[PDB]
């Protein structure tokens, strides 16, 4: 039946990190051999399984969250980590059971003017539940008098966008991330 992994990995438009797209995978046969024959920059890290042992298993439901983050924030996409991407954008749970796949895209997400299409939620009231998604652009009041809708001055705009110029450093280029999370799907 050949589970759609090319529908998640090869999708050209990856959503922003605050609004990561989740693709339910079920009722098929997943061939994981296209996930360890990789090009030499991929970062196939699994938490709870091992990469060479994914074929001889069956999972109930497989979820594939995909987004775009900075290079030094791939470390934030890990179970039980605290930063900005983990705290306010994408919290993996404490008991993670899947794999975290990230590759360099200094291409594909990088204009010479800089692609401001990718946004990360810099300010939030509270930290996120695991696998929670807060897509709203609501103004976060951060001090004395919470006013109606005035922008700025302790009434900030939360979703500050990245800047992804191709002359930035290795830890700042946009690293496309796909997070597999784990009976129907088999091998």
């Amino acid at each position, epitope marked *: 039946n050949l589970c*759609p992994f*090319d*529908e998640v*990995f*090869n*999708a*050209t*438009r*990856f*959503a922003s990190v605050y609004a990561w*797209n989740r693709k339910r995978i079920s009722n098929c046969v997943a061939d994981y051999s296209v996930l360890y024959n990789l*090009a030499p920059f991929f970062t196939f890290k699994c938490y709870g399984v091992s990469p060479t042992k994914l074929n001889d298993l069956c999972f109930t439901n497989v979820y594939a969250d995909s987004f775009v983050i900075r290079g030094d924030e791939v470390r934030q996409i890990a179970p039980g980590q605290t930063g900005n991407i983990a705290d306010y954008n994408y919290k993996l749970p404490d008991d993670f059971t899947g794999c975290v796949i990230a*590759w*360099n*895209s200094n*291409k*594909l997400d990088s204009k010479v003017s800089g692609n401001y*299409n990718y946004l990360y939620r810099l300010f939030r009231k509270s930290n996120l539940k695991p696998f929670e998604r807060d897509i709203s652009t609501e103004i976060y009041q951060a001090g004395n008098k919470p006013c109606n809708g005035v922008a700025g001055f302790n009434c900030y705009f939360p979703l500050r966008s990245y800047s992804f110029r191709p002359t930035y450093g290795v830890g700042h280029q946009p690293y*496309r991330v796909v997070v597999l999370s784990f009976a129907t799907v088999c091998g």
Partner: antibody
Framework: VQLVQSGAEVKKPGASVIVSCKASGYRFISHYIHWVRQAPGQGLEWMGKIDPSGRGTTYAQKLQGRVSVTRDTSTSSVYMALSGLRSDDTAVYYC??????????????????????WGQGTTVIV | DLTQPPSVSVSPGQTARITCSGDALPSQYVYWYQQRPGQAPVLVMYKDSERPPGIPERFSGSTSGTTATLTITGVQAEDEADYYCQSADASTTYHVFGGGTKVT
């Protein structure tokens, strides 16, 4: 950059096309090449894509097993091979570029499509 | 698979909104081609927001949702041509074109 096409031709239902796309100028091992046909007065519809470095072929879902492309590194050209014409398969065959200068071999999720430097087009008649 | 209105009609100076809707387009770029009747199509509009060189600064694009739109502000008399949207399938294979909207 420019892409050279074959001439107009009239065929019979059976052995049909070795239509050629002689490319020039650009580095041939960089961009994909898409083939698109158009029935006269109808919408464009996409047939197949070829990687000139031999890294894979992919043809359309409703045209599978009937059309096959053929690469050639030496002459910097790419061919088709379709068999068994009908009146449905009377069209103008467009060879196109891909408009993506990939430097490092393939980052996953390149914007394939974006057919920029379309060839002059050649015609099949049944 | 990508569906598109068959034709639109416009008088010059107005605003024409060509639209393209597809179920396999939350995650794929949309590339617009402007085929005048008789010759090979040209990429008029690409990657949902970007503009190739050789195009006047009038051809915009928007893909808010799963329905890409092109917008012509101040249609002139030489923009009477077909407008095929494009995508792929949801993976990247089997590229699909559109309905073939005629602009008059």
């Amino acid at each position: 950059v420019q892409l050279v096409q074959s001439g107009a031709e009239v065929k019979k239902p059976g052995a049909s096309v070795i239509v050629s796309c002689k490319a020039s100028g650009y580095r041939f091992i960089s961009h994909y090449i898409h083939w698109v046909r158009q029935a006269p007065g109808q919408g464009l519809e996409w047939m197949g894509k070829i990687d000139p470095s031999g890294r894979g072929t992919t043809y359309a879902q409703k045209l599978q097993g009937r059309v096959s492309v053929t690469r050639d590194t030496s002459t910097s050209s790419v061919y088709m091979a379709l068999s068994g014409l009908r009146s449905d398969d009377t069209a103008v065959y467009y060879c196109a570029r891909d408009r993506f200068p990939l430097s490092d071999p393939y980052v996953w999720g390149s914007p394939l499509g974006g057919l920029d430097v379309w060839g002059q087009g050649t015609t099949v008649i049944v | 698979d990508l569906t598109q209105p068959p034709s639109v009609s416009v008088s010059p100076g107005q605003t024409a909104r060509i639209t393209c809707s597809g179920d396999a387009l939350p995650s794929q770029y949309v590339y617009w081609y402007q085929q005048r009747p008789g010759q090979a199509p040209v990429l008029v509009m690409y990657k949902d927001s970007e503009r190739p060189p050789g195009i006047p600064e009038r051809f915009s694009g928007s893909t808010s949702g799963t329905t890409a739109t092109l917008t012509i502000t101040g249609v002139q008399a030489e923009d009477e041509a077909d407008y095929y949207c494009q995508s792929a399938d949801a993976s990247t294979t089997y590229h699909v074109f559109g309905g073939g909207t005629k602009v008059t």
